[PDB]
């Protein structure tokens, strides 16, 4: 954390300033009441909103003038890494768990490959929401998690 | 036609799936752009 | 006949209906395995029981405070200051005791034979036979623990948890109290709803 | 109860085999073979019935501009633009309320489609019951007080056919009104009058 918060970084302010002037420059050729003008003014308003949020959410900045992320585990920045991540692992786990629920449903059947190239959508729709409680995979792990043959 | 349903759910199932995903992702961004962090906690 | 959480649908097979509060409700097949089912039954009990007191503990004082019979802070506020002993001391204490009494029912769950050793001297014991339904001193009044009677406990617990879920979520966004939230809704329901708040 | 010498949408043609003629309103019309398979068909029949019933209620929507145009009334607001109004409590709230009741209504009909029973009960009073056999004809006092619903085939068929035919007509109607407004930016009835005044030059082309 050898950095300075973005709220109080001159370089971070110079970037917002320089960016807006560039978009405003383009604003000149199109005159006022105009489609491009409204499009550029919308980018400018989207630009201000962006920088505003970064400062607002206490993100440090580097001498470069750009925010940098802390992933150490520090509590002030869970938003930077840890919070989104857990969110990921939830979804990743969801997808994988549902995907594995399908293969087991498919495995003891006729031609199993037939449903791997042509999806059983009724079956899939039945199993998709099981991923919602996928971290109760843990309780499968206490018993039938993985194969004993290997 | 059973069969038409059958053409579907092939790798057209992938594109219908990813097109839906792309749409959802795009709208989220349109709604919440330039997000570098999760700020709700 | 059993109760159907969903009329048209059929109940799953592992749900015999020999269980209190069984309405064939396992759409995600969490209880397909029987062991999981036992564990979950026990879990539902306790999650349901704590919620009962909690909802009650949380709600009633708020109501009484408004009546003016007594003055206490709102549940989401009991935490800051004002107690003999710090917050830390209570915790460690809460922990030591909760740790003992549970690391305690757990034994009865794995193998149902942990009723003796009461107190340290062995004179007193618990006589009975259902997990998560201990007897003895636990039931001073000896109300028949009739099946169906158990049905009522579960329903309340299930209800309590929706309430608890409601209180907490309601707290955010609202920034007020459940009873307060209720008054706002009661004063003018069509203008006070999740719609006006969010 | 199939009739093969029934009139057809296409007099010369041959109808598909699945379109038996047993069903009400069957003119042997499925060029795309959408009703090609029995399972799909049952579903389609129910869907058409609902669309037809809903469309008919919608037709009333056509009805109001009539009185407002001449009789008057508080129904003067055009159906178009009707939604964005301030009455009562805000629309969004209304919609949410609507979603719950109607949901229960189908999370309701749906069970019936999938099964044969559930009519069998009024959950609160398990005795009110009510029964009508057949699919999208629940029957009972709530839906069939007069009881003209229960009857005999031939009669039921005739009556039922009437239900569907009006519905199909109603469906085109509603769609026609929606398009009519956009292409004309006016009232449908005005469109109606305008047409009569100058059917010769008053058409889609006029604009
Ligand atoms: C069992 C469930 C349990 C739950 C759900 C909570 C929930 C809460 N505690 Mg609590 N606590 C719980 C147990 C315990 N707390 C405390 C001690 C405290 C303290 C000391 C504080 C809280 C505070 C808070 C609240 C933080 C406000 C917030 O984020 O608003 C959105 C929050 C309502 C904070 C509070 O009351 O702030 C006003 C607070 O300062 N709790 C102890 C013993 C030390 C507990 C023991 O079991
Ligand atoms: C059920 C059929 C139904 C149909 C066919 C329509 C159709 C319409 N609504 Mg409704 N609505 C319907 C149900 C409902 N609407 C609303 C609430 C609204 C609102 C709030 C608005 C509409 C509007 C519109 C129009 C938008 C025009 C458009 O897309 O132009 C391309 C359109 C005519 C908009 C309008 O102003 O239409 C005149 C509009 O603002 N509708 C609710 C909630 C109570 C409904 C509930 O079932
Ligand atoms: C390099 C190895 C390494 C590893 C594996 C960790 C791991 C962790 N750190 Mg650490 N850290 C490290 C190096 C490391 N750190 C270094 C070099 C520094 C110098 C700044 C820090 C400074 C630091 C701070 C200030 C904090 C952490 C915290 C944490 C914990 C956050 C995760 C959590 O909240 O619980 C898991 C949550 C779920 C599973 C949900 C996690 C155990 C945080 C912590 O203490 O946790 C309470 C925290 O406050 N770290
Ligand atoms: C044809 C062009 C078109 C247009 C004009 C719109 C317009 C809109 N979309 Mg759609 N969308 C489109 C194409 C389009 N979309 C396509 C091709 C897809 C992929 C199939 C989507 C997938 C999509 C999703 C998932 C959502 C929208 C939503 C919205 C609405 C934003 C609601 C809001 O208040 O913001 C703010 C909302 C907050 C919660 C804040 C807005 C009316 C949103 C909506 O209204 O839900 C139904 C929504 O989340 N769109
Ligand atoms: C659901 C579980 C639960 C929990 C965790 C709490 C926790 C708490 N209660 Mg509560 N209470 C509950 C249920 C609960 N209560 C129920 C079901 C009721 C009856 C409706 C009450 C009625 C109640 C009253 C009247 C008061 C509390 C108070 C308190 C606080 C001090 C408790 C204390 O002195 O130690 C126990 C010490 C003893 C000597 C006993 C503490 C936050 C007090 C408070 O508001 O803060 C001081 C207090 O005024 N509670
Ligand atoms: C005669 C007075 C007396 C005294 C001083 C104690 C004291 C004690 N009992 Mg006991 N108990 C008593 C009567 C008494 N009991 C009676 C009359 C019954 C029913 C007939 C019980 C049933 C009982 C059970 C089931 C347990 C205790 C346990 C205990 C110990 C801690 C938990 C607790 O507070 O009680 C509770 C503590 C040494 C606990 C224990 O010894 O640890 C396992 C415990 O499990 N008691
Ligand atoms: C416990 C969780 C739970 C959940 C998620 C549901 C969910 C549902 N129930 Mg069920 N029900 C439950 C427990 C539950 N029930 C229990 C314990 C009983 C007593 C045995 C019932 C008895 C019951 C009856 C009699 C009926 C339902 C019906 C419904 C559906 C109504 C849809 C709706 O409200 O409109 C939309 C709501 C929105 C928010 C949109 C819905 C799927 C109705 C149905 O037929 O659904 C198929 C119905 O008639 N329920
Ligand atoms: C021409 C339109 C039409 C026709 C011929 C029918 C005919 C029928 N309906 Mg249907 N129905 C309709 C429209 C129609 N319905 C609409 C629009 C809805 C949604 C509101 C329904 C909802 C409905 C239900 C839930 C049920 C039926 C049932 C039946 C059968 C019962 C007796 C009967 O004929 O009702 C009367 C025939 C008429 C032509 C009525 C005259 C038109 C009215 C009085 C005008 C109302 C004025 C208007 C508000 C302005 C019969 C085949 C029942 C059945 O089959 O048995 C279970 C059944 O339960 N209908
Ligand atoms: C079943 C199933 C299966 C299928 O298959 C699938 C699905 C559907 C997924 C599912 C699910 C379900 C569910 C949802 C469940 C939930 C539950 C809950 C919510 C609970 C709570 C629960 C809750 C709870 C316990 C709570 C409790 C609480 C408490 C005590 C409290 C206390 C307190 C008080 C007094 C006062 C202060 O101031 C605060 C406090 C301290 C805090
Ligand atoms: C695919 C195919 C294939 C095969 O094989 C052959 C064939 C048969 C040819 C085909 C086709 C067919 C068709 C064409 C269909 C169509 C339909 C329709 C159009 C419907 C509508 C339908 C329609 C509908 C429902 C509608 C409804 C409506 C409504 C309710 C309304 C309501 C309302 C009103 C009143 C008034 C107010 O102010 C507003 C509102 C609220 C809005």
PDB file of N, CA and C in Angstrom, chain A residues 20-87:
ATOM      1  N   UNK A  20     -11.625  14.016 -20.851  1.00  0.00           N
ATOM      2  CA  UNK A  20     -12.812  14.814 -21.134  1.00  0.00           C
ATOM      3  C   UNK A  20     -12.527  15.882 -22.193  1.00  0.00           C
ATOM      4  N   UNK A  21     -11.338  16.475 -22.145  1.00  0.00           N
ATOM      5  CA  UNK A  21     -10.949  17.474 -23.137  1.00  0.00           C
ATOM      6  C   UNK A  21     -10.828  16.861 -24.533  1.00  0.00           C
ATOM      7  N   UNK A  22     -10.349  15.620 -24.602  1.00  0.00           N
ATOM      8  CA  UNK A  22     -10.233  14.924 -25.882  1.00  0.00           C
ATOM      9  C   UNK A  22     -11.598  14.688 -26.518  1.00  0.00           C
ATOM     10  N   UNK A  23     -12.553  14.233 -25.715  1.00  0.00           N
ATOM     11  CA  UNK A  23     -13.902  13.993 -26.206  1.00  0.00           C
ATOM     12  C   UNK A  23     -14.606  15.315 -26.517  1.00  0.00           C
ATOM     13  N   UNK A  24     -14.275  16.363 -25.776  1.00  0.00           N
ATOM     14  CA  UNK A  24     -14.913  17.642 -25.999  1.00  0.00           C
ATOM     15  C   UNK A  24     -14.396  18.269 -27.266  1.00  0.00           C
ATOM     16  N   UNK A  25     -13.164  17.950 -27.603  1.00  0.00           N
ATOM     17  CA  UNK A  25     -12.574  18.496 -28.797  1.00  0.00           C
ATOM     18  C   UNK A  25     -13.356  18.048 -30.000  1.00  0.00           C
ATOM     19  N   UNK A  26     -13.733  16.784 -29.998  1.00  0.00           N
ATOM     20  CA  UNK A  26     -14.494  16.193 -31.083  1.00  0.00           C
ATOM     21  C   UNK A  26     -15.863  16.804 -31.136  1.00  0.00           C
ATOM     22  N   UNK A  27     -16.296  17.300 -29.995  1.00  0.00           N
ATOM     23  CA  UNK A  27     -17.598  17.907 -29.839  1.00  0.00           C
ATOM     24  C   UNK A  27     -17.753  19.122 -30.733  1.00  0.00           C
ATOM     25  N   UNK A  28     -16.660  19.814 -30.986  1.00  0.00           N
ATOM     26  CA  UNK A  28     -16.691  21.032 -31.792  1.00  0.00           C
ATOM     27  C   UNK A  28     -17.170  20.938 -33.249  1.00  0.00           C
ATOM     28  N   UNK A  29     -16.720  19.932 -33.976  1.00  0.00           N
ATOM     29  CA  UNK A  29     -17.099  19.789 -35.375  1.00  0.00           C
ATOM     30  C   UNK A  29     -18.574  19.552 -35.639  1.00  0.00           C
ATOM     31  N   UNK A  30     -19.216  18.819 -34.748  1.00  0.00           N
ATOM     32  CA  UNK A  30     -20.612  18.446 -34.896  1.00  0.00           C
ATOM     33  C   UNK A  30     -21.665  19.478 -34.539  1.00  0.00           C
ATOM     34  N   UNK A  31     -21.236  20.585 -33.964  1.00  0.00           N
ATOM     35  CA  UNK A  31     -22.167  21.631 -33.616  1.00  0.00           C
ATOM     36  C   UNK A  31     -22.947  21.152 -32.446  1.00  0.00           C
ATOM     37  N   UNK A  32     -24.069  21.788 -32.176  1.00  0.00           N
ATOM     38  CA  UNK A  32     -24.846  21.398 -31.032  1.00  0.00           C
ATOM     39  C   UNK A  32     -25.846  20.288 -31.254  1.00  0.00           C
ATOM     40  N   UNK A  33     -27.083  20.665 -31.485  1.00  0.00           N
ATOM     41  CA  UNK A  33     -28.171  19.709 -31.606  1.00  0.00           C
ATOM     42  C   UNK A  33     -27.759  18.714 -32.633  1.00  0.00           C
ATOM     43  N   UNK A  34     -27.211  17.592 -32.198  1.00  0.00           N
ATOM     44  CA  UNK A  34     -26.774  16.604 -33.163  1.00  0.00           C
ATOM     45  C   UNK A  34     -26.642  15.202 -32.612  1.00  0.00           C
ATOM     46  N   UNK A  35     -26.727  14.207 -33.482  1.00  0.00           N
ATOM     47  CA  UNK A  35     -26.609  12.839 -33.022  1.00  0.00           C
ATOM     48  C   UNK A  35     -25.235  12.512 -32.461  1.00  0.00           C
ATOM     49  N   UNK A  36     -24.160  12.899 -33.246  1.00  0.00           N
ATOM     50  CA  UNK A  36     -22.851  12.582 -32.676  1.00  0.00           C
ATOM     51  C   UNK A  36     -22.619  13.318 -31.391  1.00  0.00           C
ATOM     52  N   UNK A  37     -23.104  14.536 -31.322  1.00  0.00           N
ATOM     53  CA  UNK A  37     -22.899  15.329 -30.141  1.00  0.00           C
ATOM     54  C   UNK A  37     -23.517  14.676 -28.936  1.00  0.00           C
ATOM     55  N   UNK A  38     -24.707  14.135 -29.103  1.00  0.00           N
ATOM     56  CA  UNK A  38     -25.369  13.506 -27.989  1.00  0.00           C
ATOM     57  C   UNK A  38     -24.648  12.247 -27.604  1.00  0.00           C
ATOM     58  N   UNK A  39     -24.061  11.585 -28.590  1.00  0.00           N
ATOM     59  CA  UNK A  39     -23.301  10.355 -28.396  1.00  0.00           C
ATOM     60  C   UNK A  39     -22.004  10.634 -27.646  1.00  0.00           C
ATOM     61  N   UNK A  40     -21.361  11.745 -27.982  1.00  0.00           N
ATOM     62  CA  UNK A  40     -20.112  12.127 -27.340  1.00  0.00           C
ATOM     63  C   UNK A  40     -20.373  12.642 -25.924  1.00  0.00           C
ATOM     64  N   UNK A  41     -21.411  13.460 -25.771  1.00  0.00           N
ATOM     65  CA  UNK A  41     -21.812  13.943 -24.453  1.00  0.00           C
ATOM     66  C   UNK A  41     -22.209  12.802 -23.522  1.00  0.00           C
ATOM     67  N   UNK A  42     -22.640  11.691 -24.111  1.00  0.00           N
ATOM     68  CA  UNK A  42     -23.025  10.512 -23.350  1.00  0.00           C
ATOM     69  C   UNK A  42     -21.789   9.740 -22.904  1.00  0.00           C
ATOM     70  N   UNK A  43     -20.744   9.785 -23.724  1.00  0.00           N
ATOM     71  CA  UNK A  43     -19.474   9.160 -23.379  1.00  0.00           C
ATOM     72  C   UNK A  43     -18.779   9.975 -22.297  1.00  0.00           C
ATOM     73  N   UNK A  44     -18.884  11.296 -22.409  1.00  0.00           N
ATOM     74  CA  UNK A  44     -18.331  12.208 -21.416  1.00  0.00           C
ATOM     75  C   UNK A  44     -18.997  12.002 -20.058  1.00  0.00           C
ATOM     76  N   UNK A  45     -20.317  11.842 -20.069  1.00  0.00           N
ATOM     77  CA  UNK A  45     -21.068  11.619 -18.839  1.00  0.00           C
ATOM     78  C   UNK A  45     -20.777  10.233 -18.274  1.00  0.00           C
ATOM     79  N   UNK A  46     -20.482   9.291 -19.162  1.00  0.00           N
ATOM     80  CA  UNK A  46     -20.107   7.941 -18.759  1.00  0.00           C
ATOM     81  C   UNK A  46     -18.682   7.934 -18.214  1.00  0.00           C
ATOM     82  N   UNK A  47     -17.861   8.844 -18.727  1.00  0.00           N
ATOM     83  CA  UNK A  47     -16.481   8.984 -18.283  1.00  0.00           C
ATOM     84  C   UNK A  47     -16.418   9.536 -16.867  1.00  0.00           C
ATOM     85  N   UNK A  48     -17.134  10.635 -16.633  1.00  0.00           N
ATOM     86  CA  UNK A  48     -17.179  11.267 -15.317  1.00  0.00           C
ATOM     87  C   UNK A  48     -17.687  10.294 -14.264  1.00  0.00           C
ATOM     88  N   UNK A  49     -18.732   9.552 -14.612  1.00  0.00           N
ATOM     89  CA  UNK A  49     -19.312   8.555 -13.721  1.00  0.00           C
ATOM     90  C   UNK A  49     -18.296   7.482 -13.325  1.00  0.00           C
ATOM     91  N   UNK A  50     -17.488   7.058 -14.292  1.00  0.00           N
ATOM     92  CA  UNK A  50     -16.486   6.024 -14.064  1.00  0.00           C
ATOM     93  C   UNK A  50     -15.474   6.446 -13.004  1.00  0.00           C
ATOM     94  N   UNK A  51     -14.716   7.500 -13.299  1.00  0.00           N
ATOM     95  CA  UNK A  51     -13.717   8.027 -12.370  1.00  0.00           C
ATOM     96  C   UNK A  51     -14.315   8.338 -11.001  1.00  0.00           C
ATOM     97  N   UNK A  52     -15.536   8.865 -11.004  1.00  0.00           N
ATOM     98  CA  UNK A  52     -16.249   9.195  -9.774  1.00  0.00           C
ATOM     99  C   UNK A  52     -16.443   7.962  -8.894  1.00  0.00           C
ATOM    100  N   UNK A  53     -16.781   6.845  -9.504  1.00  0.00           N
ATOM    101  CA  UNK A  53     -16.991   5.648  -8.738  1.00  0.00           C
ATOM    102  C   UNK A  53     -15.713   5.082  -8.177  1.00  0.00           C
ATOM    103  N   UNK A  54     -14.643   5.136  -8.949  1.00  0.00           N
ATOM    104  CA  UNK A  54     -13.393   4.582  -8.481  1.00  0.00           C
ATOM    105  C   UNK A  54     -12.918   5.295  -7.249  1.00  0.00           C
ATOM    106  N   UNK A  55     -13.015   6.611  -7.256  1.00  0.00           N
ATOM    107  CA  UNK A  55     -12.615   7.388  -6.108  1.00  0.00           C
ATOM    108  C   UNK A  55     -13.534   7.112  -4.953  1.00  0.00           C
ATOM    109  N   UNK A  56     -14.806   7.032  -5.272  1.00  0.00           N
ATOM    110  CA  UNK A  56     -15.826   6.803  -4.285  1.00  0.00           C
ATOM    111  C   UNK A  56     -15.671   5.482  -3.592  1.00  0.00           C
ATOM    112  N   UNK A  57     -15.118   4.499  -4.283  1.00  0.00           N
ATOM    113  CA  UNK A  57     -14.967   3.198  -3.657  1.00  0.00           C
ATOM    114  C   UNK A  57     -13.610   2.896  -3.094  1.00  0.00           C
ATOM    115  N   UNK A  58     -12.913   3.950  -2.745  1.00  0.00           N
ATOM    116  CA  UNK A  58     -11.613   3.838  -2.147  1.00  0.00           C
ATOM    117  C   UNK A  58     -10.690   2.850  -2.776  1.00  0.00           C
ATOM    118  N   UNK A  59     -10.218   3.170  -3.953  1.00  0.00           N
ATOM    119  CA  UNK A  59      -9.294   2.318  -4.635  1.00  0.00           C
ATOM    120  C   UNK A  59      -8.051   3.127  -4.658  1.00  0.00           C
ATOM    121  N   UNK A  60      -6.923   2.533  -4.329  1.00  0.00           N
ATOM    122  CA  UNK A  60      -5.690   3.281  -4.357  1.00  0.00           C
ATOM    123  C   UNK A  60      -5.342   3.541  -5.817  1.00  0.00           C
ATOM    124  N   UNK A  61      -4.358   4.379  -6.083  1.00  0.00           N
ATOM    125  CA  UNK A  61      -3.908   4.672  -7.445  1.00  0.00           C
ATOM    126  C   UNK A  61      -2.405   4.590  -7.408  1.00  0.00           C
ATOM    127  N   UNK A  62      -1.753   4.460  -8.548  1.00  0.00           N
ATOM    128  CA  UNK A  62      -0.306   4.384  -8.561  1.00  0.00           C
ATOM    129  C   UNK A  62       0.276   5.661  -9.104  1.00  0.00           C
ATOM    130  N   UNK A  63       1.596   5.814  -9.079  1.00  0.00           N
ATOM    131  CA  UNK A  63       2.155   7.051  -9.602  1.00  0.00           C
ATOM    132  C   UNK A  63       1.696   7.265 -11.037  1.00  0.00           C
ATOM    133  N   UNK A  64       1.349   6.168 -11.706  1.00  0.00           N
ATOM    134  CA  UNK A  64       0.841   6.218 -13.072  1.00  0.00           C
ATOM    135  C   UNK A  64      -0.475   6.987 -13.163  1.00  0.00           C
ATOM    136  N   UNK A  65      -1.246   6.935 -12.093  1.00  0.00           N
ATOM    137  CA  UNK A  65      -2.505   7.637 -12.044  1.00  0.00           C
ATOM    138  C   UNK A  65      -3.646   6.697 -12.274  1.00  0.00           C
ATOM    139  N   UNK A  66      -3.352   5.411 -12.221  1.00  0.00           N
ATOM    140  CA  UNK A  66      -4.357   4.401 -12.447  1.00  0.00           C
ATOM    141  C   UNK A  66      -4.557   3.550 -11.225  1.00  0.00           C
ATOM    142  N   UNK A  67      -5.862   3.152 -11.003  1.00  0.00           N
ATOM    143  CA  UNK A  67      -6.047   2.335  -9.805  1.00  0.00           C
ATOM    144  C   UNK A  67      -5.296   1.039  -9.850  1.00  0.00           C
ATOM    145  N   UNK A  68      -4.962   0.514  -8.684  1.00  0.00           N
ATOM    146  CA  UNK A  68      -4.254  -0.733  -8.535  1.00  0.00           C
ATOM    147  C   UNK A  68      -5.023  -1.541  -7.524  1.00  0.00           C
ATOM    148  N   UNK A  69      -5.003  -2.854  -7.648  1.00  0.00           N
ATOM    149  CA  UNK A  69      -5.770  -3.693  -6.754  1.00  0.00           C
ATOM    150  C   UNK A  69      -5.008  -4.404  -5.671  1.00  0.00           C
ATOM    151  N   UNK A  70      -5.611  -4.484  -4.498  1.00  0.00           N
ATOM    152  CA  UNK A  70      -4.995  -5.163  -3.389  1.00  0.00           C
ATOM    153  C   UNK A  70      -5.692  -6.503  -3.240  1.00  0.00           C
ATOM    154  N   UNK A  71      -4.932  -7.582  -3.344  1.00  0.00           N
ATOM    155  CA  UNK A  71      -5.475  -8.921  -3.250  1.00  0.00           C
ATOM    156  C   UNK A  71      -4.917  -9.717  -2.081  1.00  0.00           C
ATOM    157  N   UNK A  72      -4.181  -9.039  -1.243  1.00  0.00           N
ATOM    158  CA  UNK A  72      -3.547  -9.608  -0.056  1.00  0.00           C
ATOM    159  C   UNK A  72      -4.557 -10.264   0.877  1.00  0.00           C
ATOM    160  N   UNK A  73      -5.774  -9.733   0.887  1.00  0.00           N
ATOM    161  CA  UNK A  73      -6.802 -10.189   1.803  1.00  0.00           C
ATOM    162  C   UNK A  73      -7.251  -9.037   2.676  1.00  0.00           C
ATOM    163  N   UNK A  74      -6.553  -7.915   2.585  1.00  0.00           N
ATOM    164  CA  UNK A  74      -6.864  -6.739   3.388  1.00  0.00           C
ATOM    165  C   UNK A  74      -8.334  -6.461   3.294  1.00  0.00           C
ATOM    166  N   UNK A  75      -8.946  -6.184   4.430  1.00  0.00           N
ATOM    167  CA  UNK A  75     -10.384  -5.963   4.519  1.00  0.00           C
ATOM    168  C   UNK A  75     -10.992  -4.792   3.778  1.00  0.00           C
ATOM    169  N   UNK A  76     -10.202  -3.766   3.547  1.00  0.00           N
ATOM    170  CA  UNK A  76     -10.707  -2.612   2.852  1.00  0.00           C
ATOM    171  C   UNK A  76     -10.881  -2.853   1.372  1.00  0.00           C
ATOM    172  N   UNK A  77     -10.327  -3.937   0.853  1.00  0.00           N
ATOM    173  CA  UNK A  77     -10.414  -4.195  -0.571  1.00  0.00           C
ATOM    174  C   UNK A  77     -10.993  -5.503  -1.024  1.00  0.00           C
ATOM    175  N   UNK A  78     -11.852  -6.095  -0.231  1.00  0.00           N
ATOM    176  CA  UNK A  78     -12.436  -7.362  -0.597  1.00  0.00           C
ATOM    177  C   UNK A  78     -13.191  -7.187  -1.880  1.00  0.00           C
ATOM    178  N   UNK A  79     -13.697  -5.995  -2.081  1.00  0.00           N
ATOM    179  CA  UNK A  79     -14.431  -5.674  -3.280  1.00  0.00           C
ATOM    180  C   UNK A  79     -13.534  -5.829  -4.472  1.00  0.00           C
ATOM    181  N   UNK A  80     -12.269  -5.518  -4.279  1.00  0.00           N
ATOM    182  CA  UNK A  80     -11.292  -5.629  -5.337  1.00  0.00           C
ATOM    183  C   UNK A  80     -11.053  -7.059  -5.795  1.00  0.00           C
ATOM    184  N   UNK A  81     -11.017  -8.018  -4.881  1.00  0.00           N
ATOM    185  CA  UNK A  81     -10.751  -9.392  -5.274  1.00  0.00           C
ATOM    186  C   UNK A  81     -11.593 -10.479  -4.665  1.00  0.00           C
ATOM    187  N   UNK A  82     -11.556 -10.566  -3.355  1.00  0.00           N
ATOM    188  CA  UNK A  82     -12.238 -11.615  -2.645  1.00  0.00           C
ATOM    189  C   UNK A  82     -13.736 -11.717  -2.816  1.00  0.00           C
ATOM    190  N   UNK A  83     -14.446 -10.606  -2.790  1.00  0.00           N
ATOM    191  CA  UNK A  83     -15.882 -10.677  -2.935  1.00  0.00           C
ATOM    192  C   UNK A  83     -16.292 -11.149  -4.309  1.00  0.00           C
ATOM    193  N   UNK A  84     -15.633 -10.555  -5.371  1.00  0.00           N
ATOM    194  CA  UNK A  84     -16.043 -11.036  -6.694  1.00  0.00           C
ATOM    195  C   UNK A  84     -15.697 -12.488  -6.911  1.00  0.00           C
ATOM    196  N   UNK A  85     -14.558 -12.892  -6.381  1.00  0.00           N
ATOM    197  CA  UNK A  85     -14.076 -14.241  -6.516  1.00  0.00           C
ATOM    198  C   UNK A  85     -14.990 -15.292  -5.972  1.00  0.00           C
ATOM    199  N   UNK A  86     -15.443 -15.107  -4.751  1.00  0.00           N
ATOM    200  CA  UNK A  86     -16.328 -16.064  -4.158  1.00  0.00           C
ATOM    201  C   UNK A  86     -17.501 -16.172  -5.083  1.00  0.00           C
ATOM    202  N   UNK A  87     -17.882 -15.059  -5.672  1.00  0.00           N
ATOM    203  CA  UNK A  87     -19.009 -15.048  -6.570  1.00  0.00           C
ATOM    204  C   UNK A  87     -18.723 -15.950  -7.731  1.00  0.00           C
TER     205      UNK A  87
END
